[PDB]
Amino acid sequence: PVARRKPEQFIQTGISTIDVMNTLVRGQKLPIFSGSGLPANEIAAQIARQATVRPDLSGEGEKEEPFAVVFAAMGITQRELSYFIQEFERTGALSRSVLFLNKADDPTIERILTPRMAL
Amino acid sequence: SKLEAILSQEVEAEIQALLQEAEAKAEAVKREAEEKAKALLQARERALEAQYRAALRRAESA
């Protein structure tokens, strides 16, 4: 806890009502409290293929950072797994990401170990 | 006769100047129609430019 600084820049995520009214800074961990039948996986795919840093909006540092989406889906319906394979490989925004996926029928201890792997 | 021609040419000049300003009103209508036309065509130019520019971006990354 001495070896970290505070988060001070921002990120755009494509979503307007995230970019303007409750900003995602780089270091923040903000959860999306979905409902039950609401689209949460669609907003997952949208933030996954639309997030981009804006160093041009800063005082023009380097683009030496690339961006990387580590996407870890645990306990999914497998219909949604087809949704994630096509909605990642569709636009060619799979090339800056890594998908740790597991279905619902896969055993429970992989649904334990998955966010350890991704983080 | 004489007074017919005098007063009728007066009404002619008055309503001819006013109806040519109404032709200028119609010409401002055509002017703004050309404005909306060029805004239509140029926004569609920008739209097709940006869409197929991003399509080249996506085909490049794929």
CATH number, residue B36: 1.20.5.620
Give the chain A residue whose CA is nearest to the CA of B54: A91
Question: Is A69 within 8 Å of chain B by CB?
Answer: no
Give the type of residue at B36.
K
Which tokens sit at B48?
């097709």
Residues of chain A neighbouring B58 (CB-CB closer than 8 A): 91-92
Which tokens sit at A103?
């279905």
Which residue, among A42, A7, A3, has the nearest Cα to A27 in the 3D structure?
A7
Give the type of residue at B44.
R
Which tokens sit at A98?
């890594």
Residues of chain A neighbouring B54 (CB-CB closer than 8 A): none
Query: Which residues are paired to A11 by β-bridges?
Result: A24
Buried b (16+ CB within 10 A) or exposed e, B22-56: eeeeeeeeeeeeeeeeeeeeeeeeeeeeeeeeeee
Distance, CA of A73 to CA of A44 (rounded, Å): 10
Which residue, among A35, A7, A39, has the nearest Cα to A15 in the 3D structure?
A39
Domains in chain B: how many in total? Answer: 1
8 Å CB contact between A94 and A57: no
Burial (Cβ within 10 Å: 0-12, 13-18, ≥19) of residue A64: exposed
Query: Which residues are paired to A98 by β-bridges?
Result: A70
Q: Give the closest-approach CA distance of B23 to chain A in angstroms.
A: 47
Buried b (16+ CB within 10 A) or exposed e, A13-40: bebeebeeeeebeeeeeeeeeeeeeeee
Which residue, among A45, A89, A108, A53, has the nearest Cα to A71 in the 3D structure?
A45
Question: Is B56 within 8 Å of chain A by CB?
Answer: no
- Which of B51, B56, B58, B60 to mutate to probe the A interface, most A CBs <10 Å? B58
Phi-psi region of A12 (alpha: psi -120 to 50; beta: other; left: phi over 0): beta
